[PDB]
Amino acid sequence: SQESLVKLFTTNELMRWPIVQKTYEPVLNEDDLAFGGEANKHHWEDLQKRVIEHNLRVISEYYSRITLLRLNELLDLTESQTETYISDLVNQGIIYAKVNRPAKIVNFEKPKNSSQLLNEWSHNVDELLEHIETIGHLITKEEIMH
């Protein structure tokens, strides 16, 4: 019960809110004082916030630009709820996104600098070259011996 529950959020992966809501209601309401207390029944509402918050962090890595219309399916929340739950996350400083209020697009990516983007090209070119050097003596080795 514990095993399945935990691994979902440990690993970076998309797991929809309605699958958690349905499945894990009968499993976890049995144990008291986290989901089956009377003061902790209303911690099922706080299960909802965490799954979708997880969903948004995973999506942040994996997308870099997404429409808002797609994103409502990904979280299963409506348009109004999606925009609002992103905007608070910018205040707690977990993400940086730019949120377009007419229901347009939401971009979880960063303003960049000319320099930074070409640092990656600096690395791809070096590493590519590195490979050409290693390859060159491995070819000779297999040439003589085989």
């Binding site: 905007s87 996104a97 377009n100 209020r101 007419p102 347009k104 971009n107």
Partner: protein, 96 residues
């Protein structure tokens, strides 16, 4: 001592603490004459009003990029023309 401006002080103070321009806007209109009644009260309450609007405005627009000004006026609770004229004045200073 008791005046209508003693009533003003408590209304305004509570409004500024809330961050509510709605409570503020109402208070400024009903207690307009108490502000006319003294120069010092008058100068500082409008510098308090301008700054209250500014401060609350940055939060709405904090994600940035294509935010409706209909969305803005909702939160703010004031007419569109009032909000748009603030928006032009502040862009000019260049503070966003």
């Amino acid at each position: 001592y008791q005046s209508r401006g003693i009533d003003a002080m408590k209304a305004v103070a509570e409004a500024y603490n809330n961050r509510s321009l709605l409570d503020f806007n109402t208070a400024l209109k009903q207690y307009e004459k108490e502000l006319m009644g003294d120069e010092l009260t008058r100068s500082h309450f409008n510098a308090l009003y301008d700054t209250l609007l500014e401060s609350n405005l940055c939060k709405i627009i904090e994600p940035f990029e294509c935010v409706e000004i209909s969305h803005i006026s909702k939160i703010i609770g004031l007419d569109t023309q009032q909000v748009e004229g603030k928006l032009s004045q502040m862009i000019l200073d260049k503070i966003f």
